[PDB]
């Protein structure tokens, strides 16, 4: 988020880069879930406020913080 | 080793200086267990005669009178 | 079909209720403390009954300690268990020296059929209105209904406080008005006994039927005993009226024989678990394999039951037979009656008659004329009323002749017939084709039954009143719940079934079409921003380091005086550990030991160990792939798909199992190669040897060989003469076919040991090298040399050892040399027990610290630990590897067989044991040990060092000891010399030692 | 084939009588295996 | 399996174990078989796993416990896994060929940390939490490669 | 064992069928099981004995003899006999030769300590405070011949041969026949250092306060097969060069 | 079968049970198959079953009564299966 998402314009520089960080957050959920669940990041639209969408994933999989 | 030298002289036409070298490539590339049939022992030496060929650079009626004399 | 299944040696007795009472009570205790069972659950009552039913002095001493040493301050669930407990102790004492009881206390369910919006048919058994107890169920059964018309409230605490319903379990409730007087005149109950009228029909008798229902009312309040009742029961497999009867029998301390068609480990375990939950004090359960379709098994079975324990039988004498075995025949109309129906007719009738015939012969034999056997016949009310049952109805209706034959033959003093007309019984609580319509029949004003209710009904025909009645005249019990009075039942049933299939099928099609209309009118923007994303889990394999608690919680555990009191240089502490063995690692073995099944992470490690899957990072057929991949086909495998793809294969090729020859250099215990010396009676046909080899024959044989140069070749001829010795191979068939082997595909390569090493070192060294690495990883020590930041090179020791060592290298230097096979010249150094430790030092540690290798046979690991500790306290080593390691080979397998130490596998198979259930410690039937292979390793340190390095600390090695026994003439006999660890003096034991009190000891410091 | 209940405390005089009651005269399995191995191992070439 | 039960029962009798407080047996060889020299190392691994979980695994092949073993009031022989509120200590007993008994007591590691200061403990905790991450890094790297 | 005539066996293929010989029923089925097609076995209907025809392609083992270059060893003097110390034949004909050297060494060591009756120790010290911390580099090596070579040759070998092989049994027999301690037993394997390791294990056992007394030492036998294997490592002096 | 009480039911009674019941059913089964084969649906065969009035009332008949009483299921099965247009049952309770 620090390197691909731009605070001034409050948007991702490139949408292929948003895709990149979404694909990564999906892999956190795959790695840290015990059981087949529905994803917390359904649409990559949700990433457009990206600190809220990071907390959402690392609340539900707090092992990933550590 | 009499029959293994005599098979390399009739099948491939190798004399007793090259028959030595074919048996030395058959020692480095020794089989894991006893070869079952005489056909496997020949298939083996046919492979080791064409592997001697690679290293050095070499490119390629009366068994009834016997079977009586065995009986006698 | 007619093949013999029964052997006496396959009979499994379960009788150890004294042990299963204590296990059941502890299992309830922790279930209540971890809030799995609450004070509202009925299972805490059900479970209480089964602990009362097994009450003895030991079990009260046990419950007193476990319940009078719970700190109720520690949480709300610790208050619950102490309140419940105190009660359960008070009950158990009241009922000590009182016969145990079948008392079912489960919530009686009804059937419920639901069809959703999309036309999916759901079946769910559903708590009834006004029937929340079995007391109530007997009232409901007595009243009958509107269609059965021929032309009382004891308050409890179920489902609010089960600790109060526990208090009321011994209190034997007496009632004035029985439920005989509830039965309204001009109405037939749902459960009723019949009476034969002189015309020869059977009619509802009101007065017999009262007696039955009054016994059933009391069974429900007080409960029934079956103490001293001996029972044969057939077709009592899992999910049957058979099996809910079995529970009830055992629950009243019956002694039951139970026959299974399909005898297996999976079944012998089902039965172990019923007996260990239900078998009350004095109960016993024998499980025999059995074919009821075999004449010769029926003859055998009753011979085994009646025969003396001395001639290998039981010594019993049956007080009830319950022959409920059946094969199901469906879609067999009268044109299709063939072998299956002819064979079924033998199970369900002629061999029933032959089994009752048999008990009459064995009872007469011994002049037993006053101890008859109640035969409970499973009758149908419906003979040919459905069809497509094959010879089922012809089978059932012919059992109705036994009611007459009892008066007309010579067997009434051995047998008593009690025909149960068993009605509509809802198979399981899932979708049986019959279940979905149960709800529909019930609307007629009729009753269907759970199997627990139909069990209850039939256990009422074993009460001492209807037993006393059976012994006068035969007893016909009608446990059909008014289905006689629904008319044209076949068509009525088939209406109901039509109208659910229609209503579903229609509503499934009208659903699918209204979701293709919508999809055409509104496209794939209304049905695509809707279909959600799912997340299949991957396998995060964890090291399972221990949970460190916040310091404030840690001071609560230990006494306050302990701070500053111990010298931690002189506390020893396990810092990591690992193993290679039949279930892989310490990680995977724990998942099998504790849980019996593998996790997603266990399947992946096992799959990885056995080389079923391999990692891939690059291009798979053009595509870029990063994941696991089948090691053979290189095809991509997901973690969720590992269990499906590979579990079966992992479980077949792990554990105790048949010895796999490819693992032991083609050792096949069925074909064990020996050589017999024979004398050449007549001269052999010459063969050619080298010069060298011929002189070697001449040197050995002398006169008795002739060797002659062949002058062309230089090769020699070798004539073995008359009187020469030869060795001709033969093959023993050996009776030890099973061993605990490392899982098939385990390979030191997958850990990353080089072929230089593998093709040099003995197999046992590879188990050790992997165990030492995987033990430093458990201690968070990825680079051994990191130790030498903290500790001098001379202060890491190895105090591990083997019982026998490099056993494959002894084959090399005794057998293989003798056979002039090629054997490495340094084979002798690999044999030595002190070399596995050499290779660990030579390839990992590079310590110049102690090496003290023990040999302790089967105790070498605990000796290792002892040598290890005393090495650390001596101040010779700060760190020490400690463990043991041993390989299974052909020759030890054999030598343990000759000592009769190991289980003979052919005896094991006679008893119908699978290789899994062949190691059974503490068991009645245990008959020798199971040879296995592998290594264990622990790392031990000073606690001082462990806290400085910040390595995990898995435990404290408080004590470790070794002891010889006494004068004897038997090296393999175990003894008691380890008792000397409890040696203390008790002459002067009136006042306390102040040295034991830690407070004193701290004041002195 | 026969084995009394406690042979290990019973003298070989009294065992010999309990077997003889049910003993045909033939050499059985164990002592036909040991005469075969005496002759196989401890007799010369030809001598069966 | 009688000789071992008998010595455990006589240690426990002589040290005034509370009547009604039997030690729980575990018989891990039901699952692994007897690897003679390795026997006690697997028993020890198993005991540290029991210690740090308070899960006592059951002899799943204990069909029927020998009537001879009910005379041993101070031992329980469980057939199922018992998940407890905690285990403080575990005995490990190994009998060998050649008159070669052994015992080890393993005490739960939370008894160590009562002997040290809050500063020292908090320092150690940090140091280990770091190690365990590093070790995981290493484990998964070495596993796939 | 004559190192000038060291007995091996070479596998050869029967190029032509052998002259039949008589076996028992049992032994013939054992030949048939091993050889399959390549043997024929036929009941002789008079005797009951079977004929055994080893066919062309069957395997045989023909003995040969290596002449070995290690002819010399430091052996116990000729005529040494455990009988002369007063060990019973029950024991001699049961236990491995190396155990006899140990039993004599432990008696003759208590005599050096003026301890003629081992039990005298238990006037001063508890039964649990006498240890044995002695050990061998290889152990009952004659018993390994029994369980690898002699079994293979279907020679008669005692059924308990495996218990005599173990390095921890010489100490078992010392406890079983003399000491009757219930004190430590910590048997080392140290190859050629096992004695000094023994002493170390011994000392640390006494300072730990586990044992007040400890037997400490080492013991090892010379047999054919170790002689040979040390020759292949070129550890031992070649006697023909010498 | 005479003097065959329930302790003495053996091969003779098991074989009789096949003559007097299972093979009766197999013979009516057979005529249904041969009649259906040829689409004969209007020319049924009256089966006259010899019934007893006395099932177990004398004894020592072996499986005789178990044989006879099981023919009384054909009266129900005629309404419940697919063979009523080929067969018609006419059970005769033949007396003394
Ligand atoms: P003895 O009374 O020494 O018993 C020897 C056997 C083999 C029975 C024993 O050591 C065992 N394995 O239980």
PDB file of N, CA, C and O in Angstrom, chain B residues 7-8 11-12 14 21-31 35 39-55 58 60:
ATOM      1  N   UNK B   7      31.448 -64.814 -28.162  1.00  0.00           N
ATOM      2  CA  UNK B   7      30.258 -64.054 -28.645  1.00  0.00           C
ATOM      3  C   UNK B   7      30.678 -62.709 -29.272  1.00  0.00           C
ATOM      4  O   UNK B   7      29.969 -62.252 -30.188  1.00  0.00           O
ATOM      5  N   UNK B   8      31.760 -62.082 -28.797  1.00  0.00           N
ATOM      6  CA  UNK B   8      32.241 -60.760 -29.299  1.00  0.00           C
ATOM      7  C   UNK B   8      33.090 -60.937 -30.570  1.00  0.00           C
ATOM      8  O   UNK B   8      33.364 -59.909 -31.223  1.00  0.00           O
ATOM      9  N   UNK B  11      29.641 -62.271 -33.396  1.00  0.00           N
ATOM     10  CA  UNK B  11      28.577 -61.233 -33.543  1.00  0.00           C
ATOM     11  C   UNK B  11      29.181 -59.930 -34.093  1.00  0.00           C
ATOM     12  O   UNK B  11      28.631 -59.412 -35.097  1.00  0.00           O
ATOM     13  N   UNK B  12      30.256 -59.427 -33.462  1.00  0.00           N
ATOM     14  CA  UNK B  12      30.863 -58.089 -33.732  1.00  0.00           C
ATOM     15  C   UNK B  12      32.192 -58.189 -34.502  1.00  0.00           C
ATOM     16  O   UNK B  12      32.536 -57.195 -35.178  1.00  0.00           O
ATOM     17  N   UNK B  14      35.333 -58.806 -33.059  1.00  0.00           N
ATOM     18  CA  UNK B  14      36.405 -58.202 -32.215  1.00  0.00           C
ATOM     19  C   UNK B  14      37.429 -59.283 -31.839  1.00  0.00           C
ATOM     20  O   UNK B  14      37.045 -60.373 -31.405  1.00  0.00           O
ATOM     21  N   UNK B  21      38.668 -54.729 -23.757  1.00  0.00           N
ATOM     22  CA  UNK B  21      38.117 -53.367 -23.603  1.00  0.00           C
ATOM     23  C   UNK B  21      36.594 -53.342 -23.515  1.00  0.00           C
ATOM     24  O   UNK B  21      36.076 -52.411 -22.852  1.00  0.00           O
ATOM     25  N   UNK B  22      35.898 -54.284 -24.175  1.00  0.00           N
ATOM     26  CA  UNK B  22      34.404 -54.414 -24.150  1.00  0.00           C
ATOM     27  C   UNK B  22      33.968 -54.946 -22.776  1.00  0.00           C
ATOM     28  O   UNK B  22      32.900 -54.492 -22.287  1.00  0.00           O
ATOM     29  N   UNK B  23      34.745 -55.878 -22.198  1.00  0.00           N
ATOM     30  CA  UNK B  23      34.517 -56.462 -20.840  1.00  0.00           C
ATOM     31  C   UNK B  23      34.871 -55.438 -19.736  1.00  0.00           C
ATOM     32  O   UNK B  23      34.268 -55.556 -18.639  1.00  0.00           O
ATOM     33  N   UNK B  24      35.761 -54.458 -19.996  1.00  0.00           N
ATOM     34  CA  UNK B  24      36.111 -53.351 -19.043  1.00  0.00           C
ATOM     35  C   UNK B  24      35.007 -52.269 -19.006  1.00  0.00           C
ATOM     36  O   UNK B  24      34.893 -51.592 -17.955  1.00  0.00           O
ATOM     37  N   UNK B  25      34.251 -52.079 -20.101  1.00  0.00           N
ATOM     38  CA  UNK B  25      33.066 -51.163 -20.163  1.00  0.00           C
ATOM     39  C   UNK B  25      31.849 -51.898 -19.567  1.00  0.00           C
ATOM     40  O   UNK B  25      30.918 -51.205 -19.102  1.00  0.00           O
ATOM     41  N   UNK B  26      31.867 -53.241 -19.567  1.00  0.00           N
ATOM     42  CA  UNK B  26      30.855 -54.143 -18.955  1.00  0.00           C
ATOM     43  C   UNK B  26      31.090 -54.300 -17.443  1.00  0.00           C
ATOM     44  O   UNK B  26      30.173 -54.818 -16.770  1.00  0.00           O
ATOM     45  N   UNK B  27      32.261 -53.882 -16.933  1.00  0.00           N
ATOM     46  CA  UNK B  27      32.643 -53.914 -15.488  1.00  0.00           C
ATOM     47  C   UNK B  27      32.263 -52.586 -14.809  1.00  0.00           C
ATOM     48  O   UNK B  27      31.752 -52.637 -13.666  1.00  0.00           O
ATOM     49  N   UNK B  28      32.547 -51.445 -15.456  1.00  0.00           N
ATOM     50  CA  UNK B  28      32.154 -50.082 -15.000  1.00  0.00           C
ATOM     51  C   UNK B  28      30.622 -49.946 -15.036  1.00  0.00           C
ATOM     52  O   UNK B  28      30.072 -49.276 -14.127  1.00  0.00           O
ATOM     53  N   UNK B  29      29.971 -50.549 -16.047  1.00  0.00           N
ATOM     54  CA  UNK B  29      28.490 -50.584 -16.240  1.00  0.00           C
ATOM     55  C   UNK B  29      27.984 -52.014 -15.964  1.00  0.00           C
ATOM     56  O   UNK B  29      27.242 -52.562 -16.815  1.00  0.00           O
ATOM     57  N   UNK B  30      28.377 -52.569 -14.802  1.00  0.00           N
ATOM     58  CA  UNK B  30      27.992 -53.904 -14.240  1.00  0.00           C
ATOM     59  C   UNK B  30      26.479 -53.920 -13.998  1.00  0.00           C
ATOM     60  O   UNK B  30      25.930 -52.914 -13.539  1.00  0.00           O
ATOM     61  N   UNK B  31      25.750 -55.028 -14.310  1.00  0.00           N
ATOM     62  CA  UNK B  31      24.329 -55.145 -13.959  1.00  0.00           C
ATOM     63  C   UNK B  31      24.112 -55.347 -12.446  1.00  0.00           C
ATOM     64  O   UNK B  31      25.024 -55.799 -11.763  1.00  0.00           O
ATOM     65  N   UNK B  35      21.829 -61.719 -14.604  1.00  0.00           N
ATOM     66  CA  UNK B  35      21.068 -61.727 -15.888  1.00  0.00           C
ATOM     67  C   UNK B  35      20.424 -63.116 -16.046  1.00  0.00           C
ATOM     68  O   UNK B  35      21.150 -64.128 -15.909  1.00  0.00           O
ATOM     69  N   UNK B  39      19.920 -64.701 -23.714  1.00  0.00           N
ATOM     70  CA  UNK B  39      19.445 -63.576 -24.562  1.00  0.00           C
ATOM     71  C   UNK B  39      19.677 -62.213 -23.873  1.00  0.00           C
ATOM     72  O   UNK B  39      19.955 -61.237 -24.611  1.00  0.00           O
ATOM     73  N   UNK B  40      19.557 -62.140 -22.531  1.00  0.00           N
ATOM     74  CA  UNK B  40      19.836 -60.933 -21.691  1.00  0.00           C
ATOM     75  C   UNK B  40      21.349 -60.674 -21.609  1.00  0.00           C
ATOM     76  O   UNK B  40      21.740 -59.485 -21.666  1.00  0.00           O
ATOM     77  N   UNK B  41      22.151 -61.741 -21.453  1.00  0.00           N
ATOM     78  CA  UNK B  41      23.635 -61.724 -21.394  1.00  0.00           C
ATOM     79  C   UNK B  41      24.223 -61.217 -22.722  1.00  0.00           C
ATOM     80  O   UNK B  41      25.308 -60.577 -22.687  1.00  0.00           O
ATOM     81  N   UNK B  42      23.536 -61.485 -23.843  1.00  0.00           N
ATOM     82  CA  UNK B  42      23.937 -61.049 -25.213  1.00  0.00           C
ATOM     83  C   UNK B  42      23.501 -59.593 -25.443  1.00  0.00           C
ATOM     84  O   UNK B  42      24.363 -58.789 -25.850  1.00  0.00           O
ATOM     85  N   UNK B  43      22.229 -59.270 -25.168  1.00  0.00           N
ATOM     86  CA  UNK B  43      21.646 -57.900 -25.191  1.00  0.00           C
ATOM     87  C   UNK B  43      22.543 -56.931 -24.399  1.00  0.00           C
ATOM     88  O   UNK B  43      22.773 -55.790 -24.879  1.00  0.00           O
ATOM     89  N   UNK B  44      23.033 -57.384 -23.236  1.00  0.00           N
ATOM     90  CA  UNK B  44      23.992 -56.666 -22.351  1.00  0.00           C
ATOM     91  C   UNK B  44      25.307 -56.383 -23.109  1.00  0.00           C
ATOM     92  O   UNK B  44      25.663 -55.191 -23.186  1.00  0.00           O
ATOM     93  N   UNK B  45      25.994 -57.411 -23.646  1.00  0.00           N
ATOM     94  CA  UNK B  45      27.331 -57.274 -24.314  1.00  0.00           C
ATOM     95  C   UNK B  45      27.213 -56.503 -25.644  1.00  0.00           C
ATOM     96  O   UNK B  45      28.213 -55.846 -26.023  1.00  0.00           O
ATOM     97  N   UNK B  46      26.063 -56.596 -26.334  1.00  0.00           N
ATOM     98  CA  UNK B  46      25.712 -55.792 -27.544  1.00  0.00           C
ATOM     99  C   UNK B  46      25.688 -54.296 -27.180  1.00  0.00           C
ATOM    100  O   UNK B  46      26.167 -53.486 -28.000  1.00  0.00           O
ATOM    101  N   UNK B  47      25.156 -53.942 -26.003  1.00  0.00           N
ATOM    102  CA  UNK B  47      25.148 -52.556 -25.454  1.00  0.00           C
ATOM    103  C   UNK B  47      26.585 -52.096 -25.130  1.00  0.00           C
ATOM    104  O   UNK B  47      26.936 -50.958 -25.532  1.00  0.00           O
ATOM    105  N   UNK B  48      27.386 -52.946 -24.464  1.00  0.00           N
ATOM    106  CA  UNK B  48      28.770 -52.634 -23.980  1.00  0.00           C
ATOM    107  C   UNK B  48      29.787 -52.667 -25.143  1.00  0.00           C
ATOM    108  O   UNK B  48      30.877 -52.054 -24.975  1.00  0.00           O
ATOM    109  N   UNK B  49      29.473 -53.353 -26.258  1.00  0.00           N
ATOM    110  CA  UNK B  49      30.280 -53.371 -27.510  1.00  0.00           C
ATOM    111  C   UNK B  49      30.080 -52.064 -28.301  1.00  0.00           C
ATOM    112  O   UNK B  49      31.047 -51.637 -28.985  1.00  0.00           O
ATOM    113  N   UNK B  50      28.884 -51.459 -28.217  1.00  0.00           N
ATOM    114  CA  UNK B  50      28.529 -50.142 -28.830  1.00  0.00           C
ATOM    115  C   UNK B  50      28.913 -48.961 -27.906  1.00  0.00           C
ATOM    116  O   UNK B  50      28.880 -47.807 -28.404  1.00  0.00           O
ATOM    117  N   UNK B  51      29.253 -49.212 -26.630  1.00  0.00           N
ATOM    118  CA  UNK B  51      29.778 -48.191 -25.669  1.00  0.00           C
ATOM    119  C   UNK B  51      31.318 -48.166 -25.691  1.00  0.00           C
ATOM    120  O   UNK B  51      31.897 -47.106 -25.339  1.00  0.00           O
ATOM    121  N   UNK B  52      31.957 -49.288 -26.053  1.00  0.00           N
ATOM    122  CA  UNK B  52      33.411 -49.387 -26.370  1.00  0.00           C
ATOM    123  C   UNK B  52      33.715 -48.613 -27.669  1.00  0.00           C
ATOM    124  O   UNK B  52      34.720 -47.848 -27.702  1.00  0.00           O
ATOM    125  N   UNK B  53      32.882 -48.843 -28.700  1.00  0.00           N
ATOM    126  CA  UNK B  53      32.811 -48.123 -30.001  1.00  0.00           C
ATOM    127  C   UNK B  53      32.880 -46.591 -29.815  1.00  0.00           C
ATOM    128  O   UNK B  53      33.637 -45.944 -30.574  1.00  0.00           O
ATOM    129  N   UNK B  54      32.106 -46.035 -28.868  1.00  0.00           N
ATOM    130  CA  UNK B  54      31.997 -44.575 -28.565  1.00  0.00           C
ATOM    131  C   UNK B  54      33.321 -44.027 -28.002  1.00  0.00           C
ATOM    132  O   UNK B  54      33.736 -42.926 -28.437  1.00  0.00           O
ATOM    133  N   UNK B  55      33.939 -44.762 -27.064  1.00  0.00           N
ATOM    134  CA  UNK B  55      35.137 -44.338 -26.265  1.00  0.00           C
ATOM    135  C   UNK B  55      36.393 -44.377 -27.161  1.00  0.00           C
ATOM    136  O   UNK B  55      37.170 -43.386 -27.122  1.00  0.00           O
ATOM    137  N   UNK B  58      35.380 -46.808 -32.964  1.00  0.00           N
ATOM    138  CA  UNK B  58      35.235 -47.988 -33.883  1.00  0.00           C
ATOM    139  C   UNK B  58      33.764 -48.060 -34.341  1.00  0.00           C
ATOM    140  O   UNK B  58      32.871 -48.171 -33.459  1.00  0.00           O
ATOM    141  N   UNK B  60      30.837 -49.976 -37.108  1.00  0.00           N
ATOM    142  CA  UNK B  60      30.471 -51.269 -37.766  1.00  0.00           C
ATOM    143  C   UNK B  60      29.568 -50.954 -38.979  1.00  0.00           C
ATOM    144  O   UNK B  60      29.202 -51.908 -39.706  1.00  0.00           O
TER     145      UNK B  60
END
